[PDB]
Subunit: 150 residues, 12 copies
């Protein structure tokens, strides 16, 4: 249990989010992942914290990063993307550290899409779940982590 | 097509939320609904806007109030409570005004609870859905309406 | 044993129907609820009867009205709208008067819409069910009530 | 693109309906298919139109017939009977002519019967679906084709 | 937690129960809701208590009433009728007061009827469910509240 | 009300049964459809009746034949083959004549095959259902018709 | 048939009930099955009747006792315990004597436990079903039988 | 691989069949289980065979009796009654002897009753399944066992 | 047990395919069923074989024809259309001749359509299944039959 | 909590296991139930313990024996065989003694067989579950019980 | 927007396909993955194009490669193997470039195997789907990409 | 093939098992994965065998390792952890070598946990499945591998 002052917020981005801004902008906006990173840095700095923002298309890599967060970070904001719907491994990785504040963010409103996107394994462990609020949802994520680590 | 300056944000609260603060505090907190209304006032004032905060246990009264919002309010933040899981009628009321920003809020993380609580009819229409962020999710909801109204 | 001559036909409209004509015209049309009442008044007048045309967003008020109709009305034409899919209470209220002719009307074709709209509780009691015939469906309902009540 | 004045309405009847009036009169009534055809003739005549009334126990023949309508008829009133629940081929035939007005009719209230009768494939293409209005439902069918063909 | 001596037992009746005795007598009997009320007065009196007997067709009103019971009554006997199968709101209302004794009553045996009537949301909170015992199940509900209020479990 | 003495038992056979004896002998045997017919004539003759034995690959043809039985035969022994699993039309055709004795026969034990073969629409109307008794199931079907048409 | 003064009420207890009072007291109480029997004898005595109270872990033995009840008892109060959820045999035993009043009792609130406990086969035959009223449910069961026997 | 001449056909009856004749005659007829046994005696005798006719309300006793048949009888005609729908144990017991002919009989047409009555565990092992042919179904059962025992 | 040299490939087309070209061309194209036949002939000829191309809206007729394919043709290319999803009779007809090469073809990509179109009874017997490759799927079908018959 | 030193380990075998060694040898092998009992004795003696090995085809008798194990044994190694899939009663019997170490064994890999065999009611109570390790799975059960009963 | 002449076709093979030819030859045949690459090179050579043939057991790697194709290749022939049934990530990666012709290929007839193999997440995005046509299915994939890219 | 004497037993550990002993002790215990490795080494030594003990959070790596086992190991003891419930790829890797003895081990009693954990894809291929026997279950795994390779 590290404070925002003492350790960064881990910001984990799942598969395909590296291409944010290039595709279906009605759904994902025209902002890039670098744009989202800047939003997070800004939100975190208003609370005196920092962020460790990362993206990967590999499930095992995200699990590896979650374990790292357990030791060195004050919380996790995670947009699991497609792995939200299929990754028990990601869920179990978040379950390994009980105390750590976790906020799940979906840029798109998953509940308006295909029936298989309605269920997220991460939601049973996330403290909070933000969906369909665009890239603003990442800001919400940082704010809630700030409130929880506080 | 109203700005925060021209009309208040309707903040609609479903059944049993009048008792916020007296029950299951691990889930719902120790803040009262009056406390939540005070938070929403301040959150909207940060954007120069105002709120019209209401609560009812009646699904029909909620529908009636959604219809009013279509003509009088700049958006809706709604916490449908139990009616999230049962009310097609509230979903259809929200669907009668396509341009109105709508943000759904759940104090608790409904995805951690019983399986019948995992589905929300309101989520198919709401612009955004915030769950499990405590009463702070209302602040999120107001900020998302302020952003959607502002563009 | 109550004709159209002895008592009005109750035309009951469920939630959101008060905004008919303003929303989704491809599905619902551009006629108003008032236009619908006019179509019912006329169809009833052609059979020597009259209509008592009501609308509510409240499930309980619909139930109260169905109880009133048992005593004062020759039949019910009901568009339950969203309550078709959720209200066991309205089904049960229609079931409290066995002999009263009941016709269920849906302006849209609910079978072309989402899977949750495909089922209606009211349909297991309604004598007949008319769907996707537009506002003309209410004229068919009055006509079926006239035939049954006759 | 045909009107009621320029081409007949096709009234298509599915399997077992040739026996209307001899069986389960609680469900189907004491009227015969000839009585139904007279109702349709009368209803079409009130809009200055004509009917082409047909019955078949064969799914493929119904398909064949539906194809003939595209070319020669102003709309279809179809009582698919048992094929309502089983026939994707009838559904697809009806889908081959997007503009043709189609109204599905069930004499019985299929929603009061066995669960396998609750679903109809035809209902996803039919402009309108009338069920449980007895043989009167064919009159409604013809009236709705007249409205649709006249718009 | 109020005793029977200090506060009435609330008896809440859901939709269509105003018509009891008029319809389907094989299922519901020929007694009316006022006969039911008399039975409850009698049973409560036998334990030194009183009832506050109410009926509504409105889900919201039943929720409002459950909230009143929370502060003013000793327990609730509820026949949710149709709302049994659809109302998470009523379930949640009953969930807001953890120690209030609650007994759910169905006149009819819902397990012998349509499959949609077999499930009741109320049953996961109720501290006893009585079904198919006719109007006598309201007496059983009163007796069970009396036993729960009186106990110091 | 037609007796064995006054009218033949209609013996109906579904799709692919014309090939009996040519395929999967472990399931269907090495006897042919003509051998089955001989078995039925013989079983019927012992009670002084006769059989009208037919086979079709066409659902609508089977329906047509069922209607024919209503008036001319004393009962139906039916092996619907694939149509048992898909035809609501055949079930409804059998439903049109309440009093007529009907016995459903499967050569194979359909409950030992793929899950989609487990359900038969015909079984909810058939007075009796014989499955997995080989071609001897037809003889039981004639014997059962003979007792039903005799009490 | 039989009245309370003519024959005893059969009270039948299914599996694991012999251990009542030892395990899971939160769910089942701290009273023993012998305490339950005494509750029942008192309840019946107040109506001029008697009780024949039994317990078995064997489904067949329960069936054998239900058959016995048909000829010698005024009704049955049955807590089928785990057999509620699995035994069609016991349901069918109860169904063999139409007029015998039957009341099903569960000590625990089966609707608050595992989902497989929500369904009881006995409930479709039982006149009344009492669940989650603790051992007092047995008292309600006797009272109900007394009302139905006397009518 | 017993012939009808060497051992009896076992006719096993499940729960509640002891009451046959007393209830629901519309579905079950007014013949008693003793009537059915006599019918089975005569049916087997037409093929030179005999029967061993038993009834129990106990699932475990039916399993015990199926085990006995594997060694002592030429086939099994079984009407499992309610255990058709619930007893994996009785299915497994019949599966323990691969060559024994088995024919399942239901007096009632189970496919017309409640949905839970539509499935039988026994039907996946039984060579043949006869339902809704009344007590005559037992005759069909014996005839089928005579044919299967006769072919080899 | 015949070769492309000794017997034709039966190309069977199910219901509504007689109308190919006149309906939904994004899904079915603008080529006709006569064009498809020409394509089949060209492809069978490149392997020295011939085709017997047929169409019917009748399930029973299709079964009759599969039965003829057995002592007469060298394989079947079948586009069952709607009967794919409904016809156990057709599946069973294809099952009576164990050795006959069968290739199933759908012009549309049935996995992108309604849920009831996702399942095909025919696919459990078909050697190969080609979907959503337009009318070119029929050439694939002939080519596969050629390779199987080889 | 009875130790290995002071009370036998109950080895409870369900229906049909008396025939081990006579059928489906690829699934169950060629060892007999007697051979399994010897393996158990040997495995237990290696830990200073003994075994009380039993088999029955009767679900109620298994329950009665589970009840005995609560008072006389140090743990139970149970192979419920077909009752694994059907018996709520045996699961509830096991649930009446919280602390008793219980290990479920299946000779066959139940997950490779029919879908109805995939689920076992005993598995939600068993400390551990061993499947498809052959008769060696009983030695693993004895070894787990030794570890759980020990310290 | 690239043609066969200006950019290679990406051929992506999923997990376990590296072992092709070593087991279950009834299902998978006795040709190697290298034998399959040769078939693809030759089919593409005949339409003037080239192939970039790859295999991986890693879902994230397959997503990484799909992102590459979006900018450097004219089309994708993908045999997702086991990831066809589990990978929403792969579906989403393919959905990020709407114009690219995608053809899904299965060597075995997935509809004749276990019920979990019947659904493919890839089939809802693939232009076409070829199953059960053995390694020859890859040649149809290439032929179909040639047709669509033109 | 290889015996215990000639090749090591592969012991494969899936995601999150690297943290064994640090979390959820009631379910997983306080022994570490090094403790589990020692138990495996001890159990195999008692049979004249050796072990090759590995862990990864990466599904494709686990697949790569399974392929290695095929040529180099006498059998596999595998605790797939979360991948039991989601990985068709691992199940397919295991099926690539029919005769290799495979024993699946779960430390926790997956049947007492959430409903999604009750199903394992690996269980349809594994010779035996041990669950809820704690870290002792690996010992059972090794013993069973020893009996099968014999």
């Amino acid at each position: 249990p590290r404070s925002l002052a003492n350790a960064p917020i881990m910001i984990l981005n799942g598969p395909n989010l590296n291409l944010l801004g290039q595709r279906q902008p009605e759904i994902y906006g025209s902002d890039t992942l670098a744009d989202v990173e800047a939003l997070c840095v800004k939100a975190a700095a208003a609370h005196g914290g920092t962020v460790d923002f990362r993206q990967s298309n590999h499930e095992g890599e995200l699990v590896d990063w979650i374990h790292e967060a357990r030791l060195n970070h004050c919380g996790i904001v995670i947009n699991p993307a497609a792995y939200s719907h299929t990754s028990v491994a990601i869920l179990d990785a978040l379950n390994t550290c009980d105390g750590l504040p976790v906020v799940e963010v979906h840029i798109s409103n998953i509940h308006q899409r295909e029936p298989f996107r309605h269920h997220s394994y991460v939601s049973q462990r996330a403290d909070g779940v933000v969906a369909g609020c665009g890239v603003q949802g990442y800001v919400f994520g940082v704010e809630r982590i700030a409130a929880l680590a506080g």
